[PDB]
Amino acid sequence: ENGYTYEDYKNTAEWLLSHTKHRPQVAIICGSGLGGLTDKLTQAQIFDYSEIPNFPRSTVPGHAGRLVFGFLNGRACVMMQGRFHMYEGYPLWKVTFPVRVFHLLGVDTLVVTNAAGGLNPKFEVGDIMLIRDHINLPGFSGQNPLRGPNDERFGDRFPAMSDAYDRTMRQRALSTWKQMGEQRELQEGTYVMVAGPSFETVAECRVLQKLGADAVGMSTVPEVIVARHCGLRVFGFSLITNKVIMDYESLEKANHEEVLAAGKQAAQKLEQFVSILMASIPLPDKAS
Ligand SMILES: C[n+]1cn([C@@H]2O[C@H](CO)[C@@H](O)[C@H]2O)c2nc(N)nc([S-])c21
Numbered sequence: 001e002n003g004y005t006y007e008d009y010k011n012t013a014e015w016l017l018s019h020t021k022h023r024p025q026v027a028i029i030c031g032s033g034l035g036g037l038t039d040k041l042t043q044a045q046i047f048d049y050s051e052i053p054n055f056p057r058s059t060v061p062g063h064a065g066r067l068v069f070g071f072l073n074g075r076a077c078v079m080m081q082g083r084f085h086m087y088e089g090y091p092l093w094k095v096t097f098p099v100r101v102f103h104l105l106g107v108d109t110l111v112v113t114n115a116a117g118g119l120n121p122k123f124e125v126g127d128i129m130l131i132r133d134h135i136n137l138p139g140f141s142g143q144n145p146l147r148g149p150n151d152e153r154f155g156d157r158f159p160a161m162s163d164a165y166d167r168t169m170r171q172r173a174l175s176t177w178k179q180m181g182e183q184r185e186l187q188e189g190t191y192v193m194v195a196g197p198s199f200e201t202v203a204e205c206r207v208l209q210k211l212g213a214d215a216v217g218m219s220t221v222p223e224v225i226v227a228r229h230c231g232l233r234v235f236g237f238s239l240i241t242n243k244v245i246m247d248y249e250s251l252e253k254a255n256h257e258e259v260l261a262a263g264k265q266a267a268q269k270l271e272q273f274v275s276i277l278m279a280s281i282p283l284p285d286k287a288s
Helices: 006-017 097-104 167-179 202-211 221-230 266-280
Strands: 026-030 042-048 066-072 075-081 109-118 128-136 187-193 215-217 233-243
Touching (some): 026 097
Antiparallel strands (some): 042 066
16 A cells, blocks of 8 residues: 555556566466576566566565566466565565556466465475465554555455455365375465564464464565455465474574575475466456
8 A cells, every 4th residue: 555656556567568568467476495486487578676667676685586577387477586575674565566566467366475484283394385374463463565545446445355365276276286196285274474584482483373373474464465455366375494393392493594495396396386376377368
């Protein structure tokens, strides 16, 4: 909402259209380590956030941040490499501006990915978790991307989030994981957003556990929210880049400056999976 005016999203949308002969259908937001999806595209046309009209520029991780328009597995994409984060100082209305613009680009689906810690013991690092739901902690406190005057032009005042993670795409994804014959069934669970750049303490992991979160991370929830607000089909996965220590026999460390699951091929499986899934994302054509 706030900070930008509808014409900002307009201007930015039209500029992007008047600058890429591409017209996307699926918008993909790559989390840390899953930036590689950008190589799978063809017809790729790269834009640095910086150069696009009202697009939040990166603060430091620019060296991982640009918008790549291409084609992935028979689907016109618009990939966002290096998403924005609240912990980077971005107000949420900047963190989600891209989703808003995507929609105006004709985008009707958003697949959000991210790297998260494994709250659920079942999770093995490297596990890919289909996001079934989310606990939007900063949202409970007011840090919700929709705070401010609602633009009935993008959507309602009180969007329903109960149905955020497209049930359809989740069934398809669980199937496709199977069709691929991967063995380890695509994990699935609730994702809990938590801001602040620092990592959870043991006692905090336990509340995230209690609350019912399966994987903890610092992004995605606001994009899922302004996406649904616009009526974008949304589904996503989180790459369990590590397991959070629930007991005080902590020791073990797993910074971004580590990120080794995503600092490895675990992330590669997610990229290909997401690529395969382009084939299960309904076309705007429908065509019977
Ligand atoms: C697994 N680990 C990775 N992230 C996310 O990846 C980027 C770098 O860590 C960061 O942007 C971050 O979102 C994690 N996030 C949380 N809340 N907890 C853990 S244990 C965690």
